[PDB]
Amino acid sequence: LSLTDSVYERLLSERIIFLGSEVNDEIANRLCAQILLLAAEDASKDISLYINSPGGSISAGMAIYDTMVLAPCDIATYAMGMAASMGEFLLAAGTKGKRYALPHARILMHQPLGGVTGSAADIAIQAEQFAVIKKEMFRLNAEFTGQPIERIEADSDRDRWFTAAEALEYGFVDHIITR
Amino acid sequence: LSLTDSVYERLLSERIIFLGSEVNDEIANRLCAQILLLAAEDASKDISLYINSPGGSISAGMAIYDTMVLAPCDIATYAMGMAASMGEFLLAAGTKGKRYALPHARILMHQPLGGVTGSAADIAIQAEQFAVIKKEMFRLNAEFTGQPIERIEADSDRDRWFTAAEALEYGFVDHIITR
Amino acid sequence: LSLTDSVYERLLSERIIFLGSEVNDEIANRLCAQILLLAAEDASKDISLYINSPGGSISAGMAIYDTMVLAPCDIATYAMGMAASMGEFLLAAGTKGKRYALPHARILMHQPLGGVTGSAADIAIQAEQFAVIKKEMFRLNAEFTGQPIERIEADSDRDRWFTAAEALEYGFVDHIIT
Amino acid sequence: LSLTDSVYERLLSERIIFLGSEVNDEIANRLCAQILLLAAEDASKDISLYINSPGGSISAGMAIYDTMVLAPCDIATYAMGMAASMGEFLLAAGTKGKRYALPHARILMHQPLGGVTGSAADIAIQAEQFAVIKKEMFRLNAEFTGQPIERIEADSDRDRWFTAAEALEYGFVDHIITR
Amino acid sequence: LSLTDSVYERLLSERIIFLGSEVNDEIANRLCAQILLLAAEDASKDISLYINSPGGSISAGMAIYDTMVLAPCDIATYAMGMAASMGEFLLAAGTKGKRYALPHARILMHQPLGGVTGSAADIAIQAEQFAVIKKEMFRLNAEFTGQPIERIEADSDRDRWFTAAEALEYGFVDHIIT
Amino acid sequence: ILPSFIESNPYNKLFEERIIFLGVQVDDASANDIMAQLLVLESLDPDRDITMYINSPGGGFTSLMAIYDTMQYVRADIQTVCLGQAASAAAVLLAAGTPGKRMALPNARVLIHQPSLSGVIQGQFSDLEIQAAEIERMRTLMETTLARHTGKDAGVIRKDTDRDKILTAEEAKDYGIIDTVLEYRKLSAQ
Amino acid sequence: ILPSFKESNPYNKLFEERIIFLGVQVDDASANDIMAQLLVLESLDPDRDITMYINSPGGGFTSLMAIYDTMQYVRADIQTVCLGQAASAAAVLLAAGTPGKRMALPNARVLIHQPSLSGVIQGQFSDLEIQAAEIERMRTLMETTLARHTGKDAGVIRKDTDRDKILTAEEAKDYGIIDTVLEYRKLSAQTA
Amino acid sequence: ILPSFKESNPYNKLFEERIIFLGVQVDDASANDIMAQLLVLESLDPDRDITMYINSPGGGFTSLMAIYDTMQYVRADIQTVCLGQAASAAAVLLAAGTPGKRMALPNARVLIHQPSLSGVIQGQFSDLEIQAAEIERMRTLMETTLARHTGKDAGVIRKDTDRDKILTAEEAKDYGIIDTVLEYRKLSAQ
Amino acid sequence: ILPSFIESNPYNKLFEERIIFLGVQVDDASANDIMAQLLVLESLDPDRDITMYINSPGGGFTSLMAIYDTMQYVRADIQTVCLGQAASAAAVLLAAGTPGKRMALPNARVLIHQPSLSGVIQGQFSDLEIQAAEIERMRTLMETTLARHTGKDAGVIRKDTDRDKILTAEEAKDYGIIDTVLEYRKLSAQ
Amino acid sequence: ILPSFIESNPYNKLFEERIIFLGVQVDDASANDIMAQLLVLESLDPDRDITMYINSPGGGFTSLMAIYDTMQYVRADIQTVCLGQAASAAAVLLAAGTPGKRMALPNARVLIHQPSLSGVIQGQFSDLEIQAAEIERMRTLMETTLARHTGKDAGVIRKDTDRDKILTAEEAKDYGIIDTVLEYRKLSAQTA
Amino acid sequence: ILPSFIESNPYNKLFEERIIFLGVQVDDASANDIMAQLLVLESLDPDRDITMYINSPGGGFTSLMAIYDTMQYVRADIQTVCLGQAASAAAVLLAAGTPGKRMALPNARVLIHQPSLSGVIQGQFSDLEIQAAEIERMRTLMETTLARHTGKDAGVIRKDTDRDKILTAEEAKDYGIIDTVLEYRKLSAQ
DSSP: OOHHHHHHHHHHTTTEEEEOSOBOHHHHHHHHHHHHHHHHHOSSSOEEEEEEEOOBOHHHHHHHHHHHHHSSSOEEEEEEEEEETHHHHHHHTSOTTOEEEOTTOEEEEOOOEEEEOSBHHHHHHHHHHHHHHHHHHHHHHHHHHOOOHHHHHHHTTSOEEEOHHHHHHHTSOSEEOOO | OOHHHHHHHHHHHTTEEEEOSOBOHHHHHHHHHHHHHHHHHOSSSOEEEEEOOOOBOHHHHHHHHHHHHHSSSOEEEEEOSEEETHHHHHHHHSOTTOEEEOTTOEEEEOOOEEEEEEEHHHHHHHHHHHHHHHHHHHHHHHHHHTOOHHHHHHHTSSOEEEEHHHHHHHTSOSEEOOO | OOHHHHHHHHHHHTTEEEEOSOBOHHHHHHHHHHHHHHHHHOSSSOEEEEEEEOOBOHHHHHHHHHHHHHSSSOEEEEEEEEEETHHHHHHHTSOTTOEEEOTTOEEEEOOOEEEEEEEHHHHHHHHHHHHHHHHHHHHHHHHHHOOOHHHHHHHTSSOEEEOHHHHHHHTSOSEEOO | OOHHHHHHHHHHTTTEEEEOSOBOHHHHHHHHHHHHHHHHHOTTSOEEEEEEEOOBOHHHHHHHHHHHHHSSSOEEEEEEEEEETHHHHHHHTSOTTOEEEOTTOEEEEOOOEEEEOSBHHHHHHHHHHHHHHHHHHHHHHHHHHOOOHHHHHHHTSSOEEEOHHHHHHHTSOSEEOOO | OOHHHHHHHHHHTTTEEEEOSOBOHHHHHHHHHHHHHHHHHOSSSOEEEEEOOOOBOHHHHHHHHHHHHHOSSOEEEEEOSEEETHHHHHHHTSOTTOEEEOTTOEEEOOOOEEEEEEEHHHHHHHHHHHHHHHHHHHHHHHHHHOOOHHHHHHHHSSOOEEEHHHHHHHTSOSEEOO | OOOOOOOOOHHHHHHTTTEEEEOSOBOHHHHHHHHHHHHHHHHHOTTSOEEEEEEEOOBOHHHHHHHHHHHHHSSSOEEEEEEEEEETHHHHHHHTSOTTOEEEOTTOEEEEOOOBOSSOEEEEHHHHHHHHHHHHHHHHHHHHHHHHHHSOOHHHHHHHHTSOEEEEHHHHHHHTSOSEEOOOOOSTTO | OOOOOOOOOHHHHHHHTTEEEEOSOBSHHHHHHHHHHHHHHHHHOTTSOEEEEEEEOOBOHHHHHHHHHHHHHSSSOEEEEEEEEEETHHHHHHHTSOTTOEEEOTTOEEEEOOOBOSSOEEEEHHHHHHHHHHHHHHHHHHHHHHHHHHSOOHHHHHHHTTSOEEEEHHHHHHHTSOSEEOOOOOHHHHOO | OOOOOOOOOHHHHHHHTTEEEEOSOBSHHHHHHHHHHHHHHHHHOTTSOEEEEEOOOOBOHHHHHHHHHHHHHSSSOEEEEESSEEETHHHHHHHTSOTTOEEEOTTOEEEEOOOEEEEEEEEEHHHHHHHHHHHHHHHHHHHHHHHHHHSSOHHHHHHHTTSOEEEEHHHHHHHTSOSEEOOOOOTTTO | OOOOBOOBOHHHHHHHTTEEEEOSOBSHHHHHHHHHHHHHHHHHOTTSOEEEEEOOOOBOHHHHHHHHHHHHHSSSOEEEEEOSOEETHHHHHHHTSOTTOEEEOTTOEEEEOOOOOOSOOOOOHHHHHHHHHHHHHHHHHHHHHHHHHHSOOHHHHHHHHSSOEEEEHHHHHHHTSOSEEOOOOOSTTO | OOOOBOOBOHHHHHHHTTEEEEOSOBOHHHHHHHHHHHHHHHHHOTTSOEEEEEEEOOBOHHHHHHHHHHHHHSSSOEEEEEEEEEETHHHHHHHTSOTTOEEEOTTOEEEEOOOEEEEEEEEEHHHHHHHHHHHHHHHHHHHHHHHHHHTOOHHHHHHHTTSOEEEEHHHHHHHTSOSEEOOOOOHHHHHO | OOOOBOOBOHHHHHHHTTEEEEOSOBSHHHHHHHHHHHHHHHHHOSSSOEEEEEEEOOBOSHHHHHHHHHHHHSSSOEEEEEEEEEETHHHHHHHTSOTTOEEEOTTOOEEEOOOEEEEEEEEEHHHHHHHHHHHHHHHHHHHHHHHHHHSOOHHHHHHHTTSOEEEOHHHHHHHTSOSEEOOOOOSTTO
């Protein structure tokens, strides 16, 4: 029980959870367990998720996303420091009206990455699945932000960088915290 | 007892266990131990197994499968993120009527993988055992999903990607969770 | 303490122990210590050992086997997942009538593996000891399974793969769990 | 709980926290969690932050800075040993009137550091974002210290080493603490 | 503690130590500390030492042997699995009448090993010390087993594998536990 | 240690009889050497057949296509002899010889299989769409070349090469990859 | 094992017929060799064409520009032939041959794409701005060269090379990078 | 260091005497050289025996089959002489010499054993099922060649090579692999 | 592979017409070779100009100054032609050609930046202050040479070279580093 | 750096005088070279002695037996001279020269020991028994060879080579490995 | 680089004047080369002396003894000159020249010390006993040769060479390692 874990447990006792690294499978499993446990303890209070993440896998992000949506409580997502790639997806996935960006946070939107490795017959399947995943990613981003899927597709072709105010205008977040 | 270990123990008190890594001997041994422990503690309540695994060894997966089958309690399975290869096998192994997939989960069905080494005689023995394992796996998947062995043979040749809805149609899962 | 260790300790309090990795010296020492502890705590209740091992050294496995034999309480061995080389030897070494196999377990029987190095005289000494070890292993396997030593020597020549039913017919197992 | 962690816990119980390494995501997240926890525990007492750092990433430093700004509790930053780049940035960022520098502390101010990797189309975006970050950093240093943005632009070009007295004169610190 | 350490501590509370790896400085110091602590706790009850080592360094083994000799409490040594080189030396060093071998234990007896490096004068010093150590070890082995030093020196050249029965015949152990 | 003196290297003697030896991997360096030799021999005697010996495990695709285009361009007929093995790209080169003049020793083996990627290409999903399209184009080009030089539909070639297909010399003759199986000419044997 | 056969190699014979083989990755060494060969051949017979065989995976930009300037400088015309592929810089070199004298074999492949940095340059933002400006300059220079030698606008080239563009010999001829797709000259094939 | 003495080494001088050396691991690099040498020697004089000295530890299968086909193809008779060892592949090459012209020096040894795949060939089960078939075919072909050249039965050969079989010169001669054990030519002794 | 002809390769041919190729890094080996070539060329005919083709990414400072001294010492006049790029040290050498005989191809590139230490020099503060003094000396020496040869002032050079300065051929001409940008000689384009 | 002279090398000159040189470890490459040299020298003049200098630490058993058979096979008599050392295999070779014509310099050393398998051979017990039988066979063969060439019962050689045995030239002459220990032929020493 | 002149290079010219250069470590390769050179020079003209230039850090012990036996065997008188240093084995070789013709330049160096086992030898005690006895034999032999050639006593050599003893040219002459310290010949400032 190191200092980091001690403080994190203390915060978890106050329904605050963190996402501060790549979205691996381990990080997603930890976050999903935290959300399930918090929901079991109480299904009426909110859960705050702080996002300082440079991105990562899509399967892990989707595990976290489904666990967030299915939880009876409301997940309020605060973008602190950086919300890139999958972190952006999870930030914009928070309960509508409960998505915040700290004033100097930055957000990054771009299309996924991957690799093709096997033979031609396997690369065909990989490419098909890439198309499916990209289409679904853009669909969900457009749903979250309210922008047309065409605009999301055009903007994500390469790294698109947003500040807090630009993100608020776009639709990633509903507020900029200041106090 | 790190933060993740504490959370996992608390969930285990709630009869929720996780398979979030590639299935191997160690992960399988842990899962079997938890299944035995939960069955001993109470043999009338259910067990929940959340699967986010990319694959793993057939022997370890079969250990897990036998333990699930023989446990007096009902092992409901949930597919979140990715249930690929042996993970899909275990997901479909859950008690019929209690195999859920989260809306954005993905299932992957494909044939085993292996490696041949040694003299010609050893390679012949290995090929024979590969044939036996392939037959048994296809038969078990056909039993789980309700599909003929011929179709499982056809689709399992290369990677076969199902979304949650196609998985429900095929037979891997019996419900799509939406709360 | 971690999660794995916590659940293993709870099971140990339930007289269930695991052999789920290659049988090396450390694992054998730990397993022998567990059997000693459980025999000390109670000398009548059975000890359940679940085998999911791919093999390992012969000396460590023989340490485990001797501890099992000397223990005053019955050892019931469940072959779950796999039981190869020393795994199958320890599975079959469980008390007669208390050796179980799960339905989808595979049992591999093959002759010992080793290595030869050094000078010619040392190599001769090693070869003689290899012959001794092979003979003793086959004798014990014949005693466990009830097959003639010729059949164990012939079948264990390269790699003998058994399902649960084949293992029951051969004699590694007494019942299949259902 | 090792000796170092026990000491840090006992200090945190007194509202004293340390920034003693390079500012990366891990230590930034730890500091942010500590600040949130302390602000929750008592939002009327100050938080003492001791800075001995050679630098770090801008996003992590901005996470820490936003948390410091948002917290209801005043934050007093003591520069002990060495406050370089992000260390200095967070040194100047404490509550005006509560920034101190130990007498033999050095303060290093320079412009950011980074790298360009991809294709030309990606490098254009990277360069644009570099300009944005540079301008924002200089704006914030000018706000903290009180100097014109041009002076910060010129002083930060290569490297600028301040003693404690020079730093107080410039605007990073409000007092040189002596006892 | 960990599960392994928990089991080991529980056994140590019953006066059961384990020597299940190569004898080196660390293991020797741990064993000596355990024997000192057990002798302090009570100076009458025996101490059971289980040996499964494949060898190790002479100095560490001699540290363990001195601790065993000076302990007010009798020490019984059980050879399980393997007892090679210093492990065999410590097994035979147990209290005369309390040296057991499990029925399938293997014992090995070979002359010491080492290496020489440096200048010619240093190598001469090392060779003289090698002779001293070898003579001392054979003297102690002859004292433990009861065999004349000539036979110990002759057999100890290269490797001499014993089984539990041949070990009993030679003199390493006093009983085969069963 | 090849026997030669200062240069009567046996490969020089083979080349002086219009024989090119493709006994290594099919890469850019070997490809360029092969094309230089084909052009040189065509210039030396355009109306005399050039012989190629193929004992290669195959290799790159662009190098294969370079060699193939040069073989088809030159004015002289190309006689290919598969000795040892002709695997992957080399197989096409074996089948690309002038019809009739494609041969293989009795114990040679021909391996035909679809193009595969040497490693992992990483990047944005768009770059991967481009790369996957290119790989499919290359595979279809291979099927078309073999269909043209064996007399079989590209669909049959695609079905057959989906997984490694190994053919002895006789099976290669039946498949159309070669035309004759050399008969040993040892004198004492007859 | 490249045989010989006065004793000469295939490459020496090709050079005697005024043929330069650019069969390796463009870089300083190959660029210098190609420049030396071009100068030598031009001096030998200024009014006779020089043939450049291209089977290259690309290479650097400064080396490409050295070779390009030398090709466009010499008195003699340059006839470029794409052998097995011409990627990245080799595509620019292929398009740099004299109009009407650029050709490819039927199964050749051309690959045009924008300059890509190999690795990373780390430094202060004030140096990264300079590096980015230079990289943009080189990208624009590539687009301008290809526009000049293909008849297309710089904007069209920029749009097309945004991501890897693979062309066959026929698609390259349509694009404007080559003028003819070589025809086979086998006597048996024609007489059938 | 190998002394020289037109500059010629001992290897070249022996080549001019129609002597070849298979004294290295058999692979494509060595097989192509052996083949070129055999073809050149056949061309120079096809009615004169070619002596091949075999001191190899083994090698690949395709290379062995290339060398074997060339040996059985050229008109000139091949006389194999095993000096230090002929292990695995080379053993076949030793047995492939012209009947009556297979020799081994008295202390030479032969080692026949079934083909082995060192390393792991990974892939789906549907690829390993093809690799196993190819390896079985290779083993059967090795047995058939050895049985054709030794006069035994493919079944007997298969049983004998199940594990490393080490034969001395006399044992090999009795086994059919060689015909005579070279006796020493030293004049002082006789 | 650089093809020879009739036994002179292209570089030797260029050397016959008094052309020195600095197409590599400026280090000890290249510096010594270039000195040797310049001295030989001066000996053969002092009253004939010597051409220096530069395509180098620069390098050492002592090697730079050695080549520079040899260029400035030779009785013949040096004409420097930049091909591809002349960056770092090479730029100075390009600027150090005879006034009026410095040339660059139209698409060439010149890079100027102050000397930079490669790696880290560790020591006591005394050794490091000695090293810093030496490095300032080297920087000032480079500034002086460039100011001398370009007609600028040392201060302007210092300010311009604070951060890497990249000049096209025309910009280099307008900066004073070269005298003329070469024009193409092709007749089809005339 | 070995100086040539006008041309040849010292090694070429020695070969012209029929002096093979075994100065490296006895492996397959060295064995093939030595065998080729012996065959060539036998071809040039079968009635003339062939000299073989031995300065080597030993090496493989199969290479040893190849060189041994070739030495015992050629028609020319072999004269071995041990210069710096002859260890392991090279000792057998040293004893394999024609009786009467085996010499060693005064400060040479001969190291004879039984075969040792550096490295580990893994496998099933069924393969290790075969390997052990082979190693014993090769050990016995080396003992038989040394017994034949030194006039000692093979049991004596087996007992003597159980551990590394080092012999000075005189002790080797007493043993039987060599016949005469060479004497210096410097003129100044003889005249003083 | 080592320039040639008319054709030959400096080492060949030195050899033609009967000079051998031992400028590398004393190991098997250099030992074999030195012996070959000594024998060739002895054959060419036995009466004339052979000069050995020694500038080496030492090396093996059996190589030392090979070179030493060859030097003491040949019919010619061996003169030795130590140029930069003669450390360990080389010193013995320096002391092993003919009495009267052992020389060293004024600033040469001569390091003599007892044999040392580089690395670590492992094994049973019964093997290390033999190895240690061999090391002692080698040390005694080194001392014996040094005493025989320097005129000192073996015990005094054993005491002196216990630790690294570094002698200058004059100290070596006093010790007996050499006979004369070369005096410069320069005509100017004679």
